[PDB]
């Protein structure tokens, strides 16, 4: 009667599908099994046209929607957690709800691994010492014993330094911001003096 606890809460009626999906698959310990199975359906929704007609056509009746999905979903290695899921979305026309339920299941899976994104922008590419001096200030800016990925990036307008685009937080140690804030502390003291 107990479900495995969701690592972070979400919004409703389109993303808590993924919260419920994570609460089912982690009970079956099928976590990285079914997550890239959602990816294949997106490639099925990308390349093939007959399946992606079924996710947006408003004229197909409510029995051809389920009798193609359960016809396509034989065993084939596919999980019955996944097979009972994709039956349910074509049961109530929710086959358009796939591209949202994945990216929050992506978020919830990266919430199960303690594994946060970032994107660091410099003016200079990072060598094998410059990148390993970066993380020791970056891991002051995560809250706990988390992981860290790297998405190194080049832009000329920053004059050295970095900006850690956590997508939730940002730390500006770039000098182009520093010379801007140096100029604002010039003007706030030359006008007052």
């Amino acid at each position: 009667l107990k479900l495995p606890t969701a690592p972070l809460q979400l919004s409703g009626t389109s993303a808590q599908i993924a919260t419920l999906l994570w609460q089912v698959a982690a009970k079956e310990n099928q976590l990285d099994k079914v997550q890239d199975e959602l990816y294949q359906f997106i490639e099925l929704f990308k390349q093939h046209s007959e399946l992606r007609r079924l996710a947006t056509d408003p004229f197909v009746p409510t029995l051809v929607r389920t009798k193609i999905i359960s016809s396509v979903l034989k065993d084939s290695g596919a999980s019955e957690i996944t097979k009972k899921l994709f039956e349910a979305l074509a049961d109530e026309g929710a086959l358009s709800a796939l591209l949202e339920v994945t990216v929050n299941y992506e978020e919830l899976m990266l919430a199960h691994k303690k594994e946060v994104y970032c994107t660091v922008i410099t003016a200079e590419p990072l060598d094998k010492l410059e990148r390993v001096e970066l993380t020791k200030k970056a891991e002051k800016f995560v809250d706990a014993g988390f992981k860290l990925v790297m998405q190194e990036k080049i832009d000329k307008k920053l004059l050295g330094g970095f900006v850690i685009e956590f997508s939730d937080r940002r730390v500006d140690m770039s000098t182009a911001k520093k010379v801007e804030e140096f100029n604002n502390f010039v003007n706030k003291l030359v006008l007052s003096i």
């Binding site: 009626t13 419920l20 009970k27 079956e28 009972k84 899921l85 049961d91 929710a94």
Partner: peptide, 29 residues
């Protein structure tokens, strides 16, 4: 190209999560 119509959720039946939950727990062994 072929995923611009899939970019957002769209459905009827605002109580959809309660519908799918009874169709996700059966395959729980």
């Amino acid at each position: 190209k072929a995923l611009d119509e899939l970019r957002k959720p769209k459905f009827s039946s605002k109580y959809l999560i309660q519908h799918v939950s009874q169709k996700l727990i059966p395959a729980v062994k």
